[PDB]
């Protein structure tokens, strides 16, 4: 494989470019937060008398 | 069901056009077989992806056929041309016909899927429409490459009747011998035509530019919509 | 709608960019992929001509059908160019000689493909009956696109290839070398 791309520098560049632009697009659409969901979820029952 | 019907007709029209060039029932069967295998495989993939049979997936099946049939003919015909040139028997003729183009097949399907994959990522409510279609086509292209690596080569090695060295079938009988003797039509007349448009070349480039312009013209002036209204054999009337 | 916006331009831009990158890998070249991509208008002109002079609209069925024509015409263009290049590499053959030699051998398989498909999709353009609207819409664009693509590209692809190789030199070629 290394011998393959040593002779095919361009093919190597396209693989790297496609990976990058794939990631670039990913960044435009990714949610941002401090944390993902890390809290266990809770359910509260409320009642009044 | 109406789309299923045109799908079956498309296959039969392909089978007739295959039979016109390759003039062996044995040989035109090869590409024709590939279609049902790839398409039925695609339905299975559709199930894998949790898709449904709908107008867009069905139109995928139909439009895929040109792509699939191309995969089959590429392999079959490249064998045809290895035999009439080196008088080799079917089993060897396809063995290095495949050894010399199996990379191309994989490669090309890869660049072609670039045409459809980004469209899978169309977003919104109207997004699933474009995505169903892209996955169908790309799935079919994948299977078609699989089929072109597995079944088609096998079918070429066991179904293709031998061709002698130099044979071009220019004297069969009646029409078929006519079309072949006349397939060099302008395989010669055309390539002398191409050789002519190369000497100049200067203003064949200018023609292209008007085409790009007329294209730009026609395109901006053509209105856009989503999905057409259909006659569903029913309608309603409001009274207020 | 106020969610909608415009996906079209960018997605097809991404598409054109990834296609160019793929072609570059295929031929190991930044320039030669242009000879294959310049074929895109040739099929779009048919799709426009077809839909235009049949009162059709630019809708979902127009867009998907065009993708198909572009794919199938890209594929025919690639096969010509693959063989024109492999004859300048595994063989010594000069440009013009290896262009025609590749065109000859690929003329048959091209017309086989295009006609068999153009004709196979005609039951769609000729369709009457239920869902005929979508069958007519998707059908006519592909047929017009394929016809224009398939007659034009047959002459333009050889022109694309030689013109491109003679702007991105090497300054050695055009006489057939020795392996
Ligand atoms: C070129 C060959 C490959 C391409 C062919 C693709 C055409 C397939 C599209 C058919 C559309 C699907 O239509 C589907 O038909 C089958 C068969 O009647 C129905 O199936 C029904 O009958 C069959 C057999 O009688 C029962 O086994 C099944 O339990 C029942 O649900 C499905 O409920 C229906 O949804
Ligand atoms: C490199 C291979 C691929 C190259 C392909 C290049 C040609 C592709 C041309 C496809 C046609 C694009 O045409 C474009 O379609 C989009 C659909 O999102 C239309 O979008 C329009 O209609 C939709 C209908 O629901 C509305 O929601 C949207 O708000 C509106 O802008 C644009 O008005 C049109 O300009």
UniProtKB/Swiss-Prot annotation, chain A:
Segments on the Cytoplasmic face: 1-9
Top-level taxon of origin: Bacteria
Residue intervals passing through the bilayer: 10-28
Subcellular location(s) per record: Cell inner membrane
Phenotype when the gene is knocked out: Loss of susceptibility to contact-dependent growth inhibition (CDI); inhibiting cells still contact the target.
Induction, as annotated: Positively regulated by MarA, Rob and SoxS transcriptional regulators (at protein level).
Family named by the database record: Belongs to the resistance-nodulation-cell division (RND) (TC 2.A.6) family.
Record note on quaternary structure: Homotrimer, with large domains that extend into the periplasm, interacts with AcrA and TolC. AcrA may be required to stably link this protein and TolC. Interacts with AcrZ. Part of the AcrA-AcrB-AcrZ-TolC efflux pump.
Protein role: AcrA-AcrB-AcrZ-TolC is a drug efflux protein complex with broad substrate specificity that uses the proton motive force to export substrates.
Name listed for the protein in its UniProt record: Multidrug efflux pump subunit AcrB
Species annotation: Escherichia coli (strain K12)
Residues of the full protein shown: 1 to 49 of 1049
């Amino acid at each position: 494989m290394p011998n393959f791309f040593i002779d095919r520098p361009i093919f190597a560049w396209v693989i790297a470019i496609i990976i990058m632009l794939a990631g670039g697009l990913a960044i435009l659409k990714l949610p941002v937060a401090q944390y993902p969901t890390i809290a266990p979820p809770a359910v509260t029952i409320s009642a009044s008398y | 069901h109406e789309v299923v019907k045109t799908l079956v007709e498309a296959i039969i029209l392909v089978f007739l056009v295959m039979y016109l060039f390759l003039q062996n029932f044995r040989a035109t069967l090869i590409p024709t077989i590939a279609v049902p295998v790839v398409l039925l495989g695609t339905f299975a993939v559709l199930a894998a992806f949790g898709f449904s049979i709908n107008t867009l997936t069905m139109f995928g099946m139909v439009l895929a056929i040109g792509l699939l049939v191309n995969d089959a003919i590429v392999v079959v015909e490249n064998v045809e041309r290895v035999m009439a040139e080196e008088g080799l028997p079917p089993k060897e003729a396809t063995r290095k016909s495949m050894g010399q183009i199996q990379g191309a097949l994989v490669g090309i399907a890869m660049v072609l899927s670039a045409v459809f994959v980004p469209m899978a990522f169309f977003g919104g409510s109207t997004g699933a429409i474009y995505r169903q279609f892209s996955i169908t086509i790309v799935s079919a292209m994948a299977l078609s490459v699989l089929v072109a690596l597995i079944l088609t080569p096998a079918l070429c090695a066991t179904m293709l009747k031998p061709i002698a060295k130099g044979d071009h079938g220019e004297g069969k009988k009646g029409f078929f011998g006519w079309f072949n003797r006349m397939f060099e039509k302008s395989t010669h007349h055309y390539t002398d035509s191409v050789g002519g448009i190369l000497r100049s070349t200067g203003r064949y480039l200018v023609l292209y530019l008007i085409i790009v312009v007329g294209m730009a013209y026609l395109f901006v002036r053509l209105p856009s919509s989503f999905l057409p209204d259909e006659d569903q054999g029913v309608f309603m009337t409001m009274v207020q | 709608e106020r969610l909608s916006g415009n996906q079209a331009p960018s997605l097809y831009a991404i598409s054109l960019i990834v296609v160019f990158l793929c072609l570059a890998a295929l031929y190991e070249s930044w320039s030669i992929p242009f000879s294959v991509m310049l074929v895109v208008p040739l099929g779009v002109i048919g799709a426009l001509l077809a839909a235009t002079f049949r009162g059709l609209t630019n809708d979902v069925y127009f867009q998907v059908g065009l993708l198909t024509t572009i794919g199938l015409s890209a594929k025919n263009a690639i096969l010509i160019v693959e063989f024109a290049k492999d004859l300048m590499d595994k063989e010594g053959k000069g440009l013009i000689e290896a262009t025609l030699d590749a065109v000859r051998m690929r003329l048959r398989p091209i017309l086989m493909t295009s006609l068999a498909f153009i004709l196979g999709v005609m039951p769609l353009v000729i369709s009457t009956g239920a869902g005929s609207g979508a069958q007519n819409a998707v059908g006519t664009g592909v047929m017009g696109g394929m016809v224009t693509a398939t007659v034009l590209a047959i002459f333009f692809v050889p022109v694309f290839f030689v013109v491109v190789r003679r702007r991105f030199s090497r300054k050695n070629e055009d006489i057939e070398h020795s392996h």
